[PDB]
Amino acid sequence: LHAHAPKVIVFISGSCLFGAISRSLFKKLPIPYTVVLLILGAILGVVASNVPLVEEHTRDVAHMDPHVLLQIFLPVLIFESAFAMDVHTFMRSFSQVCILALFGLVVASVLTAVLAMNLFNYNWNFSEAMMFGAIMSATDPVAVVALLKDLGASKQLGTIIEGESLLNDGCAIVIFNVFMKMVFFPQLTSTVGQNVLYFLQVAVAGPLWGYAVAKVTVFFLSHIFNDALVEITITLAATYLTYYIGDIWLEVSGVLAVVVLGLIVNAEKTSISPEVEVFLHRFWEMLAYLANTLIFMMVGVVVTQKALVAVDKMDWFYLIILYLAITIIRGMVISLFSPILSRIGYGLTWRNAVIMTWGGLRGAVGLALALVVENLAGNDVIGSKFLFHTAGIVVLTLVINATTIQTLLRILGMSDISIPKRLAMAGAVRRIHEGQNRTLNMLKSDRFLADADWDIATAACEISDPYSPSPREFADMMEEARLRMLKAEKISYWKQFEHGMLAREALRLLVQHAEVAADEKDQFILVDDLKKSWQIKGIYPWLKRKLEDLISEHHMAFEVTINIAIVLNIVPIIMEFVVQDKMALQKIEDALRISNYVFFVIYAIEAIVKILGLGRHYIVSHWNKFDAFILVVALVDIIIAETLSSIKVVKLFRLLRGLRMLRLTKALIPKLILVVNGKINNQLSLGYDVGKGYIIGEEEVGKIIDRMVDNKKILRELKHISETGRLQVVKELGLLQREHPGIAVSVKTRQAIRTILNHSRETIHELQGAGLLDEMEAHKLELTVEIKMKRLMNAPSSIPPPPPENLLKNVSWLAGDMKLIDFIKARASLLHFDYGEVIVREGDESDGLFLIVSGLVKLYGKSEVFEDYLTVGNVIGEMGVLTKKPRNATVTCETTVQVYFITAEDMNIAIDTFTLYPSLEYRLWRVVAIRIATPLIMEQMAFQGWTQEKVKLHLERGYLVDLAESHFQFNIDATLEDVILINGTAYNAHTREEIRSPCLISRTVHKLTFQYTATEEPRLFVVRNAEY
């Protein structure tokens, strides 16, 4: 309670209250709240100049040390800016931002510096003018990206402006740091070589240091389970130690390190627990908000105390001229590079350039650097002028540029809402309005709410729309069909995502392509544009093959023990020689000489044991030759040390590093192979998600448009485009399996578990929603799911492809029936086929089954109408042997192929032999039945909200009826959902109407009767309601 109390708290706490007041009072007014904070800070400053008591509270901030200002606020501002943004659209447009942020910053700064030299009468030198330019070129576009996120062009113009701001803020501090030393801390004139190393440290070592710290950080985040506090604390510690260690100890650019760390930790959001990801965004937003309020408050105080005392009348004239100049300079730079930017990324239109030119608001980062000059100036007038102009420009930009950006967007015609969005919002609002009427009518019947005031209720719950054969005939219908197709596709991608079938990156790629296609004439989604997702860069296969060659050459303990021995031996090999470089402690240092002999003996025993185990074959492996040369050198230098100028010592210093530490590469190379596998896996995993998402999208939409577009000539074209896309996608993804078998298996197993766990989570919420499972108990199981989700990210990047005999075990109708697996495995024969060979042809009798264990085969049949590709795991000929009808399609190998062949005679014997309740006949028809059934139920369900998987899960509940038990079937709405005829022909009992084999049965039909025939025996599939 004495005067020693921390008076900084009242300021920090008071700043939060003032920020809240300014943010709430001016929420609907156009002027940003940050300007109000500057005025409040000025009021506080003039007050503090007159009432001593308040001065005691501002003192600890209004005269804050620069090397606490920068070390605390800047890492927060830069990390939040890096952590908040969309990295993937940023990386897919990286070069355009780099061109306009690095080189754009240089020209903008130099031009501002020249202006500051020539116009202003302050007689500044080029170092000071470059500090001025660096401060004046730092942008804070938050107020503009916020609008662009809502109105439109969010994935194009929002990211470039935000990324440009991020990079220009990062580089401005570097320039400001460089020129601050040459102004306030001038050293002796450095050599050109010294300067070059200085450039490498700030420019190259910074990003490398940040990259290393990030890759270490994400590694540990991936191994933290059920501990959110540790994750948040690790993020904080990593971000603050990256700046401190990089800036103070390593003499490396801290800001750029944090930029890279934030970007990487954003890109690897999957390694963070989902519940902590949603917390980190709000946490860093809050820290940045605190930082901004303090900077504006401090600026408001210090300008009033010690900046405005030195402003002359002509200084205002320069401020206006400077404001005009930097705005002109920014637009000049954007236009001058515009020819270059037009060729890379999303080129800038003239209206986009104006928004960027007008949207370049200045903010805290600029002001923070101005406070450094004010403090380091030591009451030299340079400090006042720096802070005066930086505050002036910020106020002008916030009062003029920010307050008119919305009207400029309206004028330029970018604030309009597209008809599709307006219709979607209107329909959603109307549906919401209808839903409330249903609820209100239901509530009015409740006994305990009959006395409620329904006028107030109805007024309160209202939701209002926020946005409130001729050539021409054929051209218009084509456009309507095209846009309706694209809109249906976008719906499918969202349904797939909401049910966990796609990762978000695949969703955003697919949606971006759909929207881009919508905006171009006669443009559908082109698989050639999607191909970039699953193209593997050539460097990684090459590295994998080379590194496997290096490592593809007895006890378990030797390698681990010795590798530990080496990794520890770095400690002597550093601490002796580094201190010897200073001695050039001897009472202690000689102990390391003695222990060096013990390490020699360790490696010697290792070599002796290895020679004994390998015997004469020790020389066969080149890796061991180095293992012997190391011992030779160690013995040689030990003899010199024991038995006997500098050549006897410096040689030791060098050799006991060179031949000492390079033998860890044996252990390392496998880790590099794993990293390379991971890089391929991350690209191949995205490829499958995008490709498979596209195929599902096309299959779902193709069943919709049959009931949306009237003109058949339009209808044929659209379904032609969908099919020519589907085939190319399924082929490209099929080939990648042959290129990278094990990584494909890893991807496919990872998708499988990801699906199982998601559906597992739904059952918990169903049980929790039904009250069978308490809230806490459900939470305890839901954690077990989420930990298992996080362990998938750490699963091996390659699973060795199972041998052919394993695939038979995992076939659907062979699963779990050992006596049948043994029967088939014995009689199943493996066949090899070369490229272009036909396995079977149309019209051939059904000789047997083919189980593709490797390769890719092309199906082509007249049933050119039919065309498809099948790959590992799929089985060909099931319909054939069951019905004994001829082949459906010709099968051609697109790659060297292996197939397990089971003769139709073996199948018939197996069908006769294995006749328990889950009969092999029942199983083979069930697997066939669902494939035939799924298209029909999906065609019926086309208008409704299910995905294809919910249609399958709906079908999996079904069963085949034993029409031998009763040769007629009757339907009941209360206990039966739908019925599908799979093979045969069926008669409605009341009319004997012809229903042919593939038909789905209409719900009006009551009773079905069949003809007792053997040649086309009736097979029928049925699904009961969940209540049986």
Residue numbers in the entry: 70 to 537, 570 to 654, 676 to 706, 725 to 784, 794 to 1012, 1030 to 1194
Please give sentences taken from the publication describing this entry.
A general observation, evident from the local resolution maps, is that in all of our SpSLC9C1 structures the protein displays substantial structural heterogeneity for most of its domains except for the TD, which indicates that it might be locked. Focused 3D classifications at the dimer level could not resolve the conformational flexibility, which suggests that the movements of the domains are, to a degree, independent within the dimer. Therefore, focused heterogeneity analysis at the protomer level with a mask excluding the TD was performed instead. For the apo dataset, four conformations with a resolution range of 3.2–3.4 Å and with substantially improved densities of all the domains could be distinguished. The most pronounced differences are confined to the region of the CHs. They are accompanied by subtle conformational transitions in the VSD and CNBD, which further indicates that the CHs might play a central role in coupling voltage sensing and cAMP modulation to exchange activity in the TD. In line with this assumption, the extended cytoplasmic region of S4 forms several interaction areas with CHs, which have to rearrange upon voltage activation.
One example is the sperm-specific SLC9C1 that belongs to the SLC9 superfamily of cation/proton antiporters, known as Na+/H+ exchangers (NHEs), which are essential for the regulation of intracellular pH, sodium homeostasis and cell volume. The transport domain (TD) is accompanied by a voltage-sensing domain (VSD) and a cyclic-nucleotide binding domain (CNBD), which are regulatory units usually found in voltage-gated cyclic-nucleotide-modulated ion channels, also referred to as CNBD ion channels. In a recent patch-clamp fluorimetry study, the functional integrity of the domains was confirmed for SLC9C1 from the sea urchin Strongylocentrotus purpuratus, termed SpSLC9C1, identifying it as a Na+/H+ exchanger that is activated strictly by hyperpolarization and modulated by cyclic nucleotides (cNMPs). Specifically, SpSLC9C1 adapted to mediate cellular alkalization in sperm only in response to chemoattractant-induced hyperpolarization.
